Each structure stands twice: as structure tokens, then as C-alpha cells.
């Protein structure tokens, strides 16, 4: 399976583990933001999930955009009326980076219901690029997940789709998920998905690869377990609606386990 890059898989994972620390947003940035909140950010990310659905963009693209926004907001103060411009420019850049066929700038202007002009979007693109210093190849939860999926005996579509769903729910809530690295959220999501569907746990072979155990994953796992349990009541619902789709095997309709029995 050259598609699974046997000769480079380990080098790549190691590389991504270095890069995720370097590409990490500052944990306590929302406190330093005078005019925006975790709640406003949650509204923004939920809207981006809708945008991704409307243009049928990759989930990877949505993950990159969120990373760009969080890093931009780690150094740049933004007024609430300008938060969606940051988000639109981040999604344009993510699309150009990750998509075969990114939507046109005009399409990105249109989805803001003409809150902003094309000039504004294009100008913000430049600003985001400057703030990020063109450092756009950031590791995401999905890049770790797809490597973790290779450790299934055998591969299970429900496990995979559910793991993605959970990793995607974590994008909505800065508190608490800003304090966890993509690789750790991917690990928690994968174990939680595996447990929900098959009753199985984080496998020994992934301890070998990652150095993560159920003991080190516990904090994030306890957070993700509570997010999953509360998902139907969360003010933001675009991911749940998205993951009802057959494309993702209707996994948002599966029931969360009451306990983790850790």
C-alpha cells in the first residue's frame, strides 16, 4: 500500500508531532480579546461547517481554516463586526491550499450575505498571510486520525466517521479544546469512537506509535465524553446535522455511552 506510505509513515507522524507544537494557537487568547468571546467564535466555526457543506469542501479544509483563525486571533485583536471577515479569508486560504477546485473569491463574498466587499476579503487574505507568515501547512486532527485508522482490526466505517464527528465537535469550543494538541484530540476521539461502536479501547499498537496511553489521554477524553453527551443541547448544531448524512454513516444518530469505565 504505497497509498499508506509504508516507507515514510513514521517520519511523517514524527514531523507532524513537531509541527503541531509550532502551529499551536495560544491557549488563553480569548481572555486577551476585548470584543469577542468563546461563544462568538463557536458561532463562527458553526457557520464555517455550513459553508463547507454548501460548497462540498473537504473536512481537512475546515480544520485548517479553524487553525488559521485561532493563530490569527492569538496575536490580532478583532472587533465583533470583523470576526466573520477573518473567518471568510481563512476559509479562502484553506480552500486554495487544500482543495482541487476552491470556490471563487466572489463565492466567498456571497456567503457573507454581502457584509463585506471583495476588496475587504482580498485585503484580509493578505493580512492573514502576513500574520501567519505564509505558514499554512498546519497539522490537523484529521491528519492524525487517518493514520490512527490504519490500526483498526479490521477497518470500521462507523468508528471512522464517528471519530471525525467528535474531532469536529471539538473545533466549536475553544474552552476547553484550545489546550489540547490535534494529535491528543484525535487520540481521544478515536478511542471514544472505537468504544462507542465496538466496545474496544485505544490499542497497544497506537501506544507504540504515539506514546499516548489512556492515562495521558484521560483529561481530553473526559472533556470529549461530556461534549459528546451534551451535543444535542449545544447551541451550535451544524456538525450534528452534517453527520446525520449517509456520507458520514449517520453517526451523529448513534448514542453516546453513559460511562467510559476507565
Amino acid at each position: 500500500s504505497v497509498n499508506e506510505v509504508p516507507d515514510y509513515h513514521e517520519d511523517i507522524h514524527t514531523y507532524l508531532r513537531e509541527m503541531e507544537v509550532k502551529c499551536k494557537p495560544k491557549v488563553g487568547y480569548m481572555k486577551k480579546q476585548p470584543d469577542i468571546t468563546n461563544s462568538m467564535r463557536a458561532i463562527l466555526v458553526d457557520w464555517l461547517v455550513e459553508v463547507g457543506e454548501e460548497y462540498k469542501l473537504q473536512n481537512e479544509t475546515l480544520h485548517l481554516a479553524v487553525n488559521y483563525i485561532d493563530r490569527f486571533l492569538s496575536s490580532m485583536s478583532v472587533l465583533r463586526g470583523k470576526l466573520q471577515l477573518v473567518g471568510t479569508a481563512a476559509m479562502l486560504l484553506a480552500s486554495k491550499f487544500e482543495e482541487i477546485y476552491p470556490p471563487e473569491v466572489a463565492e466567498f463574498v456571497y456567503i457573507t450575505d454581502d457584509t463585506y466587499t471583495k476588496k475587504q476579503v482580498l485585503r484580509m487574505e493578505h493580512l492573514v498571510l502576513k500574520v501567519l507568515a505564509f505558514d499554512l501547512a498546519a497539522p490537523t486532527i484529521n491528519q492524525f486520525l487517518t493514520q490512527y485508522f490504519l490500526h483498526q482490526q479490521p477497518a470500521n466505517c462507523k468508528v471512522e466517521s464517528l471519530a471525525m464527528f467528535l474531532g469536529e465537535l471539538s473545533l466549536i469550543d475553544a474552552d476547553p479544546y484550545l489546550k489540547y494538541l490535534p494529535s491528543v484530540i484525535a487520540a481521544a476521539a478515536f478511542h471514544l469512537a472505537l468504544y462507542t461502536v465496538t466496545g474496544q479501547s485505544w490499542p497497544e499498537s497506537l501506544v507504540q506509535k504515539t506514546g499516548y496511553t489512556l492515562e495521558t489521554l484521560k483529561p481530553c477524553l473526559l472533556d470529549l465524553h461530556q461534549t459528546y453527551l451534551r451535543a444535542p443541547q449545544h447551541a451550535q448544531q451544524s456538525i450534528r446535522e452534517k453527520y446525520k448524512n449517509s456520507k458520514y454513516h449517520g453517526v451523529s444518530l448513534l448514542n453516546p455511552p453513559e460511562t467510559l469505565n476507565v
Binding site: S1, V2, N3, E4, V5, D7, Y8, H9, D11, I12, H13, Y15, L16, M19, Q58, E60, L92, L93, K96, F97, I100, P102, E104, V105, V121, L122, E125, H126, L129, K130, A133, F134, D135, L136, A137, N142, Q143, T146, Q147, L150
Partner: protein
Amino acid sequence: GSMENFQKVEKIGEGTYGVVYKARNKLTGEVVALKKIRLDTEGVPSTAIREISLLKELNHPNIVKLLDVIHTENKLYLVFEFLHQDLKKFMDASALTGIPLPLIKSYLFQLLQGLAFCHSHRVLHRDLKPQNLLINTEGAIKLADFGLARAFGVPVRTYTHEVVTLWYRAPEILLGCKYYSTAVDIWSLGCIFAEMVTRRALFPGDSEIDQLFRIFRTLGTPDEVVWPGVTSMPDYKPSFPKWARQDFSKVVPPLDEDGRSLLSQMLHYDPNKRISAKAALAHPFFQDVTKPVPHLRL
């Protein structure tokens, strides 16, 4: 900086991009290549976005070095280290005597080094051709132009079907496979290996079908034995002529036993079986590798 510290010398290349200029830093004396990218009505091109982000990460002796990015309202300059010539022009200069073996062997070893570094950092180049391979006066060869490059995930998703200049394009791209991987870059380097030896393109097709048929006539038409899954491929046709595989000593007659062995592993039909850049570095072909200077003034 910058821009006021650079004195343009001349145009040294073009394409898209982009225009490339030879320039010199007035304060340090450093000679550089400026890749000028014109901006506008879709903002910064995805080609430039990918090339800058990827080249900022990739620091290797065999990969072109991005020194700086000068990014104003209407202009984008990529500042690169200057290299004196591309491999194509070097091959053209080398008619009548050819390129010495130690130099071909050195160049290939360095290309596999640069490529394995790319692959270890989840980057596919996707346009390895002699025009994008740059040489200096000290014996170095470097991969350049990452506008067509891509950061991949493991395992790979479906990426752009283009892809790769026709002559250097792998049979799995030509046959419309849902996935392609690191092996596409190896295929390209295989073609280039042959071309360094012969100073002519191994598979000079004028269309996709002609490209495929030229490969088939040289390597044999692949069946399920040599390439499990090939008859199931999207653009495979049962009507394809069934050419016999050539004696491999007839594909590149001046090449020795170890050279032939390696080339055949780079040109393996099955992308799963094709040699990796990393594994190719340990091939017996390179047992006596050195890094001499080019034998001609650049």
C-alpha cells in the same frame, strides 16, 4: 527586508508563476533568484500559497532554498538561492561526450536525497523534469519549483488529476487511478535517470494515449501478474495492444548491471512495488558515489 537592497541583473527564466530574475544583494553580495508573482483578481494564487508554505518548511542541501518573501499590495517576490543552470541545458551542453558516469551517479543520489526529504515531510513534488532540476558550479543538484507540489495526508486522498509534465508522468496517473502517492515522483526520477544517460527523453509522448503506448512498448503492456488491479483501472482498455517487455539492457544500452537494476525498480509498473527514494539511496549502484563538479563551465 527588502527589494531596495536587490539589483536585478537579468531574466533567467519564466513560466507560471511568474518570471524569474537573476539579482544581487547590494549589501551582502549574495546572488539570488527572484521569482516574481503578479497579483491581480482572485488574490494570491494557490500555487504561490503552496510553494511558499512548503519551501519555508523544507530545508535540505538538495532542495532549493527560499531565503525571503517580499509581499506588497500588488507584487509578490520569492527570494531564492541562485543556481547557474538547469539539468536540461546541462544535458544539451553535454552532447558529443555525454555526462560522465560519476556525475550522473552523483546527481541521481542527490535527487533521491532531496526527494526522500520531501516525502518524509509529506510533500509530493509532481513536476520532476530536468527543467526544474538546478545545478551549481560545486556539484550540487537541487529540486526547484514547488508551485505544483502538495502536502499529503496518510493515507492519501484523491488529489488533482492533471498532473506532472506528460513525458515524466506515471502510468497510474495516466490510467486514472483514484489515488496516487510518492511513487509518482519516483517514476519521474526514473525517466530523468535514463535521460541523463541518453540525453533524450525516455517516453516522449504527444498525448496521454501515445504516452501510455510508448511506455507499454518499452516496459511491456502490464497485466494482472505484473500489476494486480491494472485491468480494473478507470482508463484501462481491454483493447490496448499487448506489447512484450523489452530486454532491459536494450532500454538504456550503455547502463551497467547495477544501473539497470535500479532503473527497473524506479520504473516498476505497480506503485506498491516501485522503489522508494529512501530505499534507492542504499542501492549498490551508489557504492562508489562521489560529488564532483560539473565537467563544463556553467
